[PDB]
Design brief:
With 66 residues, this protein is mainly beta. It contains one helix and two strands. Residues 5-64 form the AFP-like domain.
Length: 66
């Protein structure tokens, strides 16, 4: 298994605008937002709290479509 997902590098509070320090790339299951999309996620808002080590999923990011 090779596909990496975006994983929270810190707790991300509800309604926070994402910054690069908050997002790492990890091979996790289930698969979330592809790691290659990190640059596109900067300044987008999360619609819930994302604990440290949580996989970022498309439904957690306001305005995200792929």
């Amino acid at each position: 298994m090779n596909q990496a997902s975006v994983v929270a590098n810190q707790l991300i509070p509800i309604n926070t605008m994402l910054t690069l320090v908050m997002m790492r790339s990890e091979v996790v299951t289930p698969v979330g937002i592809p790691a290659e999309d990190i640059p596109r996620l900067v300044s987008m808002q999360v619609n819930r709290a994302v604990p440290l080590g949580t996989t970022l999923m498309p439904d957690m990011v306001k305005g995200y479509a792929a």
